[PDB]
Design a protein around this ligand. Sequence first.
Ligand SMILES: [K+]
Ligand SMILES: [K+]
Ligand SMILES: [Mg+2]
Ligand SMILES: [Mg+2]
Ligand SMILES: [Mg+2]
Ligand SMILES: [Mg+2]
Ligand SMILES: [Mg+2]
Ligand SMILES: [Mg+2]
Ligand SMILES: [Mg+2]
Ligand SMILES: [Mg+2]
Ligand SMILES: [Mg+2]
Ligand SMILES: [Mg+2]
Ligand SMILES: [Mg+2]
Ligand SMILES: [Mg+2]
Ligand SMILES: [Mg+2]
Ligand SMILES: [Mg+2]
Ligand SMILES: [Mg+2]
Ligand SMILES: [Mg+2]
Ligand SMILES: [Mg+2]
Ligand SMILES: [Mg+2]
Ligand SMILES: [Mg+2]
Ligand SMILES: [Mg+2]
Ligand SMILES: [Mg+2]
Ligand SMILES: [Mg+2]
Ligand SMILES: [Mg+2]
Ligand SMILES: [Mg+2]
Ligand SMILES: [Mg+2]
Ligand SMILES: [Mg+2]
Ligand SMILES: [Mg+2]
Ligand SMILES: [Mg+2]
Ligand SMILES: [Mg+2]
Ligand SMILES: [Mg+2]
Ligand SMILES: [Mg+2]
Lengths: 73, 119, 88, 101
Amino acid sequence: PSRKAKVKATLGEFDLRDYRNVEVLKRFLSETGKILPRRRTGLSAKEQRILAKTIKRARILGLLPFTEKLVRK
Amino acid sequence: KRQVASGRAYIHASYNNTIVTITDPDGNPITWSSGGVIGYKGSRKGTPYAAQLAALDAAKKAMAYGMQSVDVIVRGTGAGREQAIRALQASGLQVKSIVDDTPVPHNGCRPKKKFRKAS
Amino acid sequence: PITKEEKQKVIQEFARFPGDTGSTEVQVALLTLRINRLSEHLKVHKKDHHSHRGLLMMVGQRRRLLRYLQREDPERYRALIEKLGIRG
Amino acid sequence: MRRYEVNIVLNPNLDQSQLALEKEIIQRALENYGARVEKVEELGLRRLAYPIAKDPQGYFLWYQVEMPEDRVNDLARELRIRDNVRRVMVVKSQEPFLANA
RNA sequence: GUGGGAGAGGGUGGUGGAAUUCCCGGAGUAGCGGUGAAAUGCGCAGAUACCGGGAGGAACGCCGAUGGCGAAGGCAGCCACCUGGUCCACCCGUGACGCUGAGGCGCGAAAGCGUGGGGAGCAAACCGGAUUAGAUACCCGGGUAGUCCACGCCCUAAACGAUGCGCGCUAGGUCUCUGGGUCUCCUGGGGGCCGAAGCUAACGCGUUAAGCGCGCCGCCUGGGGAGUACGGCCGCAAGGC
Ligand SMILES: [K+]
Ligand SMILES: [K+]
Ligand SMILES: [Mg+2]
Ligand SMILES: [Mg+2]
Ligand SMILES: [Mg+2]
Ligand SMILES: [Mg+2]
Ligand SMILES: [Mg+2]
Ligand SMILES: [Mg+2]
Ligand SMILES: [Mg+2]
Ligand SMILES: [Mg+2]
Ligand SMILES: [Mg+2]
Ligand SMILES: [Mg+2]
Ligand SMILES: [Mg+2]
Ligand SMILES: [Mg+2]
Ligand SMILES: [Mg+2]
Ligand SMILES: [Mg+2]
Ligand SMILES: [Mg+2]
Ligand SMILES: [Mg+2]
Ligand SMILES: [Mg+2]
Ligand SMILES: [Mg+2]
Ligand SMILES: [Mg+2]
Ligand SMILES: [Mg+2]
Ligand SMILES: [Mg+2]
Ligand SMILES: [Mg+2]
Ligand SMILES: [Mg+2]
Ligand SMILES: [Mg+2]
Ligand SMILES: [Mg+2]
Ligand SMILES: [Mg+2]
Ligand SMILES: [Mg+2]
Ligand SMILES: [Mg+2]
Ligand SMILES: [Mg+2]
Ligand SMILES: [Mg+2]
Ligand SMILES: [Mg+2]
């Protein structure tokens, strides 16, 4: 189960095809640069598919994290 | 006698043993302990207990260099990993922040048979 | 590929009459077009086997028409072929 | 012609001398391949999420162009030589598909 | 035809970061490793753990699904170019141009064969360590072919939905992917589950039929002998039909 209130909702309207809006994008990664699963992201097969796509681009442009060290264990 | 004060303590949980390494503010080790170091041999080495003392035997060698605070970094899953983390805490040493950094690959090398039915 | 423009030219200079988008004559024309395109595509990428299939489908789709035409209007036929340079 | 976008991240630790020089190379080679400027953005420096080329920071450039497809890749191969050019990413423009509007 | 759509469908070039190994440097001791427990092995020529740098090969974490594409085999990092199929809407052009399909031809996982290149990790065979009554094994340490690429062969399979292709007819409910609409819903295409009628030896099937029908192809006729022998055709061989 997940009781954290999906992303999307806590966000305005944006362009999923934008691989540069770090501030918005960033929002879809876990503590680790991991791309958040729909059960969290809050999008649709179609969105959640265009998201991941652009996220991967930003990463190549070195604007997003491929991975992150998990703080506190 | 180089005096360190603050430092890094890397825990290396394996299912076979638990080396703990202490290093200066940015890499470069100082002292370290294992499971054999302390004394055990076979599967004994991995036992969470060993992991404890191991953290500890590495705790003293640390203070001797003048260690007070430490950034704990854990790697790999394993027995007593938490032990070590738990040790260092009650080691009289300052445990600044625990942080997991196990090396996971974005799938590249074929694993030994032993690690494939799992993959 | 084939810009909306590019394709008209063909139809235009083929449609048996205004608005003729879909007569045997036309169809065969475009088919040919595509076919030729893909063909040169396979002059390279000889290993694009999956595209190669589509070729056959086209080629056959074409014969099924030519065949029709030649059987129905043996003249419209000669006409069409004599224009494209198809079959020899 | 096809509408593209040429993201370029180059060495952050430079100055108006070479930096300018790179544009005086990039901006050229573009037109040498039929590049057509539609709109350029220059967010300049920014902190990369991960260190690229040892350095932990990059200078971002942008160029919405409408060049001849047949030479897109040819355009990237070239733009890449500049040692200060550490990253080149061309990607044909698409309409911005919004969500949660 | 025109106008929109989704997609790991295919070919080519490029490119990204994580990890393994190796080499270089630091810092640093006495072990590491591995197992049920061990040992072989590696380490004072300084290993394991840690830090920075480099080289190389192969595979793309999360996204990822009970999801999508393809005719099948099969297809996942990102980008660009080339290219195939397909769906919806509008009902605009042709005017039965249709369906199936012996032989033919092309495609066809893996292993395997030929030439050349590459070789990090993994690993038939192989060399050892354990185990056991023995161990030509399972466990452990190494390790060659191969695994990777190009080109050319091989053509097999639980190549499976174990279900040939096309069309029409026969309750619905539910979940889902993707398109259109007057968008508590209707409608189209695809992926599931449950079930009407019906079918079925039963299990089960059930608008994604295994139901009611038509057309065309392929195939079956008790086990074993045997997918063997002979013959032919194919293959460099192994072998295949
Ligand atoms: K599937
Ligand atoms: K024979
Ligand atoms: Mg007539
Ligand atoms: Mg020895
Ligand atoms: Mg090498
Ligand atoms: Mg299918
Ligand atoms: Mg399969
Ligand atoms: Mg297409
Ligand atoms: Mg009409
Ligand atoms: Mg008429
Ligand atoms: Mg047929
Ligand atoms: Mg046949
Ligand atoms: Mg092979
Ligand atoms: Mg070979
Ligand atoms: Mg043996
Ligand atoms: Mg026995
Ligand atoms: Mg047995
Ligand atoms: Mg072995
Ligand atoms: Mg090995
Ligand atoms: Mg084959
Ligand atoms: Mg059977
Ligand atoms: Mg249904
Ligand atoms: Mg809708
Ligand atoms: Mg349906
Ligand atoms: Mg029932
Ligand atoms: Mg009944
Ligand atoms: Mg049922
Ligand atoms: Mg008999
Ligand atoms: Mg038999
Ligand atoms: Mg028999
Ligand atoms: Mg046989
Ligand atoms: Mg022979
Ligand atoms: Mg055989």
